[PDB]
């Protein structure tokens, strides 16, 4: 029982903090470990929190605070406030640690990526249109993506004109008792 | 991207943040396979030593869920934030 550093005297038996281990940057060496720690966390705490809880030695720590955009209490309404900033810490590990590479898009079926992607594109296209309206503009009718309902009315048009099918009056427009 | 990967210690202290060592996040179908929270009635039969060790199993378990949520969002793995909110 001999830590590589000097330990403090204030004992914390039931810490309520949540430490998030985030992926490093592409060009960073493999001895730097980035974490998201509470705003009140300091370099001495992480060094002691990483060795007594996870048994990870670190020769140095770096910390930087990330601010958050000012916003309105209710999105588009309310007083102007600012959320609590975010604190990130980068520890210099004594033993290298390399993350695994993300799975290929075709191999993420365990997370239901197919359905998730369709839903993501939908919201991406609704956020883009709501930005086109924020510029005081609209999508001309010539630029709207043809839907499945507009593609079936073009196949029928070519089937009636060609002569394959013969047009007949509609029978399900309304359920009248006269039938004439 | 084409360098020989270094050998990471199998028993590294930082492997505790990962649910699966290949994909940090756990599949939603296997992320919901948990029980229920301890009721105050069940926790009234345990000594400080058990309640002190059971506390840190939750501290390390919550860190394991925060790490997965960040990876799943950042890496666009897919769904699973509705299954973790119940686990957390």
């Amino acid at each position: 029982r001999n830590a590589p550093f000097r330990v403090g005297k204030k004992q914390i038996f039931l810490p309520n903090h949540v430490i998030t281990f985030v992926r490093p940057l592409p060009k960073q060496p493999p001895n730097l470990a980035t974490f998201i720690v509470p705003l009140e966390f300091n370099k001495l705490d992480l060094r002691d929190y990483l060795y007594h809880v996870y048994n990870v030695e670190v020769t140095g720590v770096r910390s930087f605070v990330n601010q958050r955009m000012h916003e309105q209490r209710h999105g588009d309404v309310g007083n102007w406030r600012r959320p609590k900033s975010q604190k990130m810490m980068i520890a210099e590990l004594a033993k290298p640690f390399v993350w695994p590479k993300p799975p290929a898009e075709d191999a993420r079926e365990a997370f239901d990526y197919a359905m998730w992607k369709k839903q993501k594109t939908a919201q991406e296209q609704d956020t883009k249109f709501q930005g086109i309206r924020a510029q005081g503009e609209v999508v001309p009718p010539s630029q709207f993506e043809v839907t499945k309902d507009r593609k079936a009315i073009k196949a029928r048009q070519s089937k009636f004109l060609s002569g394959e099918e013969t047009w007949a009056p509609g029978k399900v427009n309304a359920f009248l008792n006269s039938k004439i | 991207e084409e360098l020989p990967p270094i050998q990471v210690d199998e028993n590294h202290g930082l492997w505790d943040f990962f649910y699966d060592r290949e994909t940090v996040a756990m599949a939603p179908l296997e992320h919901t396979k948990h029980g229920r929270a301890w009721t105050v009635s069940e926790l009234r039969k345990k000594s400080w030593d058990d309640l002190h060790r059971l506390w840190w199993v939750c501290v390390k378990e919550r860190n394991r869920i925060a790490t997965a949520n960040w990876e799943r969002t950042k890496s666009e793995l897919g769904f699973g934030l509705a299954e973790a909110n119940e686990r957390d």
Partner: peptide
């Protein structure tokens, strides 16, 4: 099935609507 409720639900709830649509297509054939 809204566009902002489709991701707020667990997989079991979502995977239960696909069997509904799936079982709806077997009777149409």
């Amino acid at each position: 099935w809204s566009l902002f409720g489709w991701g707020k639900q667990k997989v079991e709830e979502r995977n239960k609507v696909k069997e509904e649509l799936k079982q709806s297509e077997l009777a149409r054939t």
